[PDB]
Amino acid sequence: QAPRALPELWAQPQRTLEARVTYLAADRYRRPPQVMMGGAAARSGPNRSLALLSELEKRGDLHQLAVAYLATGVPEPSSAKAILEGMRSDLRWQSADVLCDLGVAHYVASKPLDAARATEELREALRLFDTVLAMQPGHVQALWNRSLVYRDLGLPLSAMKDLTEFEHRETDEGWRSEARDRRARLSSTLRRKERWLAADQTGADLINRGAQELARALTFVDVPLLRRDFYHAVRARTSSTDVLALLPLAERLDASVGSGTVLADYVHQVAARDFSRRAPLAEQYARLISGRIPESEQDALLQRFLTSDETDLALGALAHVMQRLPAYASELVRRTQHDEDPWFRVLGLQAQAMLERQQEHYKEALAPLEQALDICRRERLVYRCIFIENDLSHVKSWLFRVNAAAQHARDGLALARPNQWDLEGVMLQALGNVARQAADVTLGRAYYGEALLMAEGDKWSTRNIHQNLAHLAIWALELDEARASLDRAMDTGLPLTQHGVAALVDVARTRRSPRDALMVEQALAREPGNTPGQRAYAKFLHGRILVEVDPARGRMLLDEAIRQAEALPLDDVSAAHARAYSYTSLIFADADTGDFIAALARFGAELGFETPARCVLGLTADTERSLLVARGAQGQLLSAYVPLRSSRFEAASMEGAVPPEMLAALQACTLVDVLARPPLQGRSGLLPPGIAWRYRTRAAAPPPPAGPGTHLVVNEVRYSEERNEVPLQWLPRTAPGAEARFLRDLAATPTQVLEAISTATEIDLATHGKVDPDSNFAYLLLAPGADGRDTLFEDSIRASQLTGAPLVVLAACEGGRPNAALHRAGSLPSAFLAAGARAVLAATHPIPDLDSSAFFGAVRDRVLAGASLAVAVRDERLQWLSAGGDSEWVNAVLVFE
Amino acid sequence: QAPRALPELWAQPQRTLEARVTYLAADRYRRPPQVMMGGAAARSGPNRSLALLSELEKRGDLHQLAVAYLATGVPEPSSAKAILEGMRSDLRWQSADVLCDLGVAHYVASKPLDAARATEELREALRLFDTVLAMQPGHVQALWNRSLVYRDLGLPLSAMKDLTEFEHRETDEGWRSEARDRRARLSSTLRRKERWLAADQTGADLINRGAQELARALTFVDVPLLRRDFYHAVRARTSSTDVLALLPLAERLDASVGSGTVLADYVHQVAARDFSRRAPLAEQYARLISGRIPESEQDALLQRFLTSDETDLALGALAHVMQRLPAYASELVRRTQHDEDPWFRVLGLQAQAMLERQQEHYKEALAPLEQALDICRRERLVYRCIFIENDLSHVKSWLFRVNAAAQHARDGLALARPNQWDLEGVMLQALGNVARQAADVTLGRAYYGEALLMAEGDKWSTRNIHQNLAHLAIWALELDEARASLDRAMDTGLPLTQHGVAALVDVARTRRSPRDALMVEQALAREPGNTPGQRAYAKFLHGRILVEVDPARGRMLLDEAIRQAEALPLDDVSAAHARAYSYTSLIFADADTGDFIAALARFGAELGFETPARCVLGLTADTERSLLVARGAQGQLLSAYVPLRSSRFEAASMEGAVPPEMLAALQACTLVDVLARPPLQGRSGLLPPGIAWRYRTRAAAPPPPAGPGTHLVVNEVRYSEERNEVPLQWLPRTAPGAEARFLRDLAATPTQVLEAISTATEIDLATHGKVDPDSNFAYLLLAPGADGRDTLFEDSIRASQLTGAPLVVLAACEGGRPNAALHRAGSLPSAFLAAGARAVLAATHPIPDLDSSAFFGAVRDRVLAGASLAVAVRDERLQWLSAGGDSEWVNAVLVFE
């Protein structure tokens, strides 16, 4: 039967859902649903008759079935999601319509949710609508629904933009009228922008005209920037009478903040000082604040300020000049350590934090920020507080504490939203940066587009936003969009920073522009790098851009960058990044030239040992280039270079990465050493189960211990009430004449396990190894202790030293690659191997009905016989699969050595 | 065809939902579902085939159809809810199984929604499971599901109790094993109790022994009570060296709170005083804290502390003693008004709020509480801030701001959960109190039962919890449970309080016990009352308990309570309660003995006028009794006394309350004056549309004005953007030679309307009258003013004085009728009548598309003709019903006079 429309479902005169579905019968102008706060109305007509839906499904009208699950009766987005995911792989429906309906289902599911959980559904819906409008720019339903999604995310300007484009593209008069009404309602946002602009102009006029602008100024007391403008206005007066004329404003905006007074006292203090010395300095300070003073004269003017008795003018000059010349931040820090005004104490703590960050000491930059935030919350002065929250979010994001960074960004945005416009745009930029750190392209792009709409006219925020958008495009491999956004960033008349330089050197390889090299030269000249690690990173950036045009000079620059990075401690983040990225660039430059022996040489050299002559596999991927080079048993060399990729390695299973010829060559090897450079380390499914292999990461394992050891089993752990994990059981296979030190139930605390692992020569951690959602640090889940903690983070394991060189077995492990990170491989197996373990093999799947004990006991017996670990695990894998055992779990058991 | 199960639906080896459904084929042990956070896995093989569901519906297997909607595939709780609500009225299915399945559907529907909306669904599921276990105590599925519901509400101990009973009652081995595993996982919340007990003992040891326990006490820095215990320990040291020895703990637990040091400084101060005089006082303070000092001895030591040079000791002693002697709270507030330590500032604000509360100034007690909440949140001290949240919740609940009170209780519970045990039990008691105030029996009982399980051994919290449970049982008309819980409260050995005495006088009327009278006498001797209103209330309670046994003395006591209450301002809450409740008790004591003339005499005398001698109806209902007494046209007296009720007057439409005999007697009256005592005032549907009736609340209407009036109309109001209300249009019928003052669009500002109504002799308010969800005050929704306020609350209207004595017409009036408020009627018509309006007729239903204008204009014309308001409205109602007009809305027009 033909799939005709069923009038009973779509007979009502009022729509049931705000979103637009793509079905023709359900997409015709019906007046919008009544907006309620507390409960919906009788959304149903014929609600959903099981006979009705059964007729629809039997006839084959799957699209109308999903649209009926969404747009009539009480919405059931999960059933519609199931049906639309089913239809996704069908050719009877337009893919744009199916993806739009799936996005509508995701959006509908988001409304009942709470913000933390509704954000995920909004992200999914936004991704679907972005796909729809990418493969059909004039999709009216996608524009409507994306405007709704943007409005729900808190981005009114993007919603208004979508509604404007919709009015451009729509033809129905009723839909266009409703879109006009919605855009007019959303345009109440611009009132805040106009009020902020009025407050800005009032503050500037107050600065330039003393108390003549007072009568207007008292009306903007609630706007945070007026305190800063009042400071600048007081510091700029050339007479005592004018300073006294600002006392009413000081008292008014001081009593609004709190009961105590710290500003009228300041006006009295400034008035008492003899103005015969102050007036020629006050005028110069006003000129400096207004920016008329040339850059060369600023140093001399600042010195003249510093060599007087007026500390407030020096404070103002230091605040205004510290950005260009961070050497003046130290003086600002020193001059306001014990300031009576909390505003300047917060400013000095912010300067301390910035000075700490400039040395890559982000970990030590948190305490001044926390103290300044406390002084904030106590004193109730919003302007400095938004900046403190922004700096805290940046610091935590750089430390990969994306949850806390996002929380700080949200707090700053909530602080800035009612009255501050530029500062809430800055907080949206902070949210976009946090999203970029977590590799969230859709949400990061949404936040950065909203901040770009808010920052129109500004030539600095525009450049920063476009640089970050280029980075987001690079991550998603839209290199054309990365090129376009970098061009937009450079078209503001400002030079790129090291962020833009990184994006450009990543993009200039395939889409070079005539001005790229000169811009990189200028930007690296202006930002050479404070620390030796930053200097090595800048050297790497220059080498990376030059390696595609002048291979000799680029190779020399990358080699000297590696040399510089090799002389610094491994805790140096910039040095490690410079070294790893220089090695990757050298490897891919050798691969491009056709020299694949050099690539394997670099593979070996990076880890500190010459690569094996046979039975070795090395793989890498940087942005859009993937290299797999290997040597067979006979020593023949085969390579698989993909110069122009299309999608980054994903799915946590790299099936099909190795070409069949390389597979055939490798199948003739006793065991294969895989030298997987990050982020391709720890992945499973790289080789078929018939091949014995191992992840090699060290030149040689620590020597085996002397004397019988003490086998350790951490099983049947009693987890806390919130963990909601099932305890696992283990039957050890202790070596002949050994001991079985059991840590079971409440005894398996982090402290007891930490002290136990330092002595055991055989460790079988039958616990769950997880990665912290916030800190992105892998930890072992154990029983709660005296402190209440129930975790053993990998940092403690790395610090701890295992004397017995144990062969650690990790069941139910979430380690290796899985989390999206190229900076550093934070994994439990790597931590255990570094701590002193001779070999680690970890299963990366939930345990298969307590049979992990038998599998790993058989492996332990096999290695006790004399077989190597790789061949032993291969034999156990083959016997497991041939005996009807589960395949997904056994194929996920990885061997590290 | 017989309803046979479908094997395909239940053939999966893994269960889909944690809950247990009652269908036999779907209730057999399948291993529990995998716990996924973020996305549901493949819950079924193909997903529910709609053809098989339609087959099930055709064959009549409705139970399996609902169970399939819930327990296989993607859950659709709405369809299952519809099917089970259909099956409720069918005798083919067991009622217990149907209600258990409906509760499971509500529980499943609660998983998507956020906490605020998931709480409603969990309440519905909990109510259904409570019903099932009330009519079938051994229902294993209900026990399992109620354990799940308790776990989801954050009540682990109740969940463990339910699982224990389940394991006592279940026979299947797999289900018993899974219940054992779930209870073992839940029993981890007792580790928190053990750690809190350890922290309490460590703090007591630190107080009693000094720094000898510092090594142990350093591990409990995160537990909130340690700061209070540290203060006590520092104050309890008799030597300077011992005081100095506590500095490590001070610095450690002070750095955790924040950067600033306020406890190291305290240690330094206590380390410099002359200990030759401090030592005896330090010892005395230690004894006072330990409680060894008798009550008759505490006053002398407190005076000694107050007269000494030591102020911290005085603060500690005053805080210890102020509970039993509230007269010392003023001294504490005075001595800590400007304290440097935020802890003692919050303590002083709390004591000030308590002093305000003790005089029934609950509104005036919010400012110190809000200030203390601000301080506790800013300075990050948790112990004091939990108490501040508890006091705020109590104060807001007393003012019937149940939403804010619930929010404060939730915040305090979240603060007190991880480490504090007794304080989190107190917060659970606060949540139960907020639920009790909102007439929420199920959630109140859940919270109070959890708080009772947590407070085992305590004899104070146990008594308070049992008194509140008695009140909750009284509200739900389970007088058996109220009696049992009052007996349980008295069995602890402590005397009842005025709360328990109120519950007892409500219970002892029908289930008197030998010790009730003596218990009431003792409790009212311990708490006679501070304010005169509280003394009047205590007199009322004594009279109400003594009126059933000794009618003469009880009647005298009730009359004296009314006399005392009538000498106090009408704003006195306790005096108003005493007067109203004493009048209700007198009415029902006269109706108890058959004297129904005295009942109507009291009906008249309560409002200040002699009751009408004919065509009058009066109705009341207190707990389980309901009296309807009326007089016919001939003056004959009829009565409908229900000595034992089973359900309170609900559904907001009192149909069937008037027996047919009394209805027939009243049908022969020109108009019926209804004297409905609260909470029965303002209810619609009391009498059929054929009877002309009105609500008489005054002795006589205000006199009419002289000269033509200014007919004021407020129509087509331009509400703000976020109100989302449809403006209403009005066509007035201004009296001959009467002005038509219009207030339209933005001219209908609350100030403008308040000014206008004070002179108009005819008012037609064509706006929306709603009750605030937060404060429960009825207000008029008007256009936004200069200040942004778009509300005219009933307090402003009552305060105003209407000089023209208008006939106010109030279309779209909501609230007052459905609310469960017996304390006082907060309603717009009452406010307008008290302001001076001669008559108010308000529609209590949404207006039917500007036909209300025609209705009320015809009513105004009819009353202008000469007929009274009641008969005119009756005639126009009859014409409206005979012309095909809507009956539901026309029946909702009530006439107040």
Side-chain angles (χ1 to χ4, degrees), chain B residues 384-397:
Chain B
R384 301 259 55 95
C385 185
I386 295 153
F387 280 109
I388 291 301
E389 300 263 41
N390 173 30
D391 283 19
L392 265 172
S393 177
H394 178 232
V395 168
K396 302 245 206 203
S397 178

Side-chain angles (χ1 to χ4, degrees), chain A residues 852-865:
Chain A
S852 282
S853 46
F855 184 127
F856 292 118
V859 166
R860 287 185 164 293
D861 273 84
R862 279 175 174 285
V863 301
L864 264 166

Side-chain angles (χ1 to χ4, degrees), chain B residues 67 173 222 225 322 398 563 581 649 812:
Chain B
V67 166
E173 191 68 12
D222 53 38
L225 92 173
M322 90 171 151
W398 200 88
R563 179 198 82 70
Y581 295 166
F649 279 112

Side-chain angles (χ1 to χ4, degrees), chain B residues 162-202:
Chain B
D162 260 305
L163 285 172
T164 302
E165 167 79 338
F166 173 91
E167 194 271 358
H168 222 83
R169 206 74 64 126
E170 176 70 340
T171 61
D172 192 302
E173 191 68 12
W175 286 118
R176 286 176 74 249
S177 154
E178 190 172 309
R180 273 196 292 274
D181 283 44
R182 286 174 182 287
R183 213 195 92 86
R185 172 152 23 93
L186 272 166
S187 266
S188 310
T189 74
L190 301 180
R191 307 302 112 72
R192 302 202 279 97
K193 167 166 189 139
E194 300 303 318
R195 175 151 203 282
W196 164 78
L197 277 166
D200 213 318
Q201 184 52 219
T202 295

